[PDB]
Structures are given as C-alpha cells and as structure tokens.
Design a protein around this ligand. Sequence first.
Ligand code: HEM
Length: 111
Amino acid sequence: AVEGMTTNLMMADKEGIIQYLNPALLQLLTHREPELAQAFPGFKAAELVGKNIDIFHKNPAHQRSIISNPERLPFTSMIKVGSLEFNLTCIAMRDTKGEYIGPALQLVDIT
Ligand code: HEM
C-alpha cells in the first residue's frame, strides 16, 4: 500500500559487516519472515547486525566490488529477495573527515 511507503535503511562497514538496521526495515523483515525464511532458511532479522553481507549474496564478489569502490557510488538496482522485490539504493557513508566508512542501503518495497 501507499500507507506502507517508508524509509528502510541498512548500513555496513567497508569489510561488509552489517552495522545497523533502522526500525522500519526491521519491522518489514519481521513481517516478511515467512518469505525470507523460505529464501534464507535460518533468517532472523534481529540477528543481522554483525553478520557479513556475503552470506546473503549469491555472487558475493559482485556486491563486494560495488561497496569497495565508493567512487562509483551511488548504485541503484531492482532486486529480488525471495518473492520480495525492492528498488535498491546504495550510497557511500563518510566520516567527519570525508573518509569512506562503508555502504548505506535504502530499499523501496515494490513487492
Ligand atoms: C548493508 C548491507 C547490505 C549491502 C551493502 C548489500 C549490498 C547489495 C547490493 C549493492 C545489491 C545490488 C546487487 C545488484 O543489483 O547487482 C544487493 C542485492 C541483494 N542483496 Fe544485498 N546488501 C545488504 C544486505 C542484504 C541482506 C540482509 C540480504 C538478505 C536478507 C541481502 C541479499 C541480497 C539479495 C538477495 C540481492 C539480490 C540478489 C543478489 O544479487 O544476490 N542483502 N545487495
């Protein structure tokens, strides 16, 4: 629904370790755990922080090349996550001195 359009955000460090999920995304992934557990059997949304993103990517070096090269960010794509569908945006996070920290992901639900 349009009432359900919100800001879904997930952050990782340069080594691909998930650092933070915002509440809207945590709520969505909890709601969608039926679909997510079919695509990713042991999936628990509250358990994602500290995990490496490589676990969830079928060709992990592809996403690694995207988040390792902040000069080529921002990156946008449409992705299928099990039976879910998202419009994905990946942007570079930087510290106060301008250094790249890792990727931030925004997902727009188009399931
Ligand atoms: C901040 C953490 C994450 C980053 C930086 C990240 C990075 C990316 C990027 C850039 C894409 C687009 C690839 C493309 O369209 O060519 C992508 C797609 C995808 N991501 Fe993630 N992702 C993250 C978290 C997750 C999580 C938690 C899951 C599983 C729940 C996941 C599973 C997928 C899947 C299934 C796709 C589409 C199919 C694939 O390329 O493997 N990602 N990810």
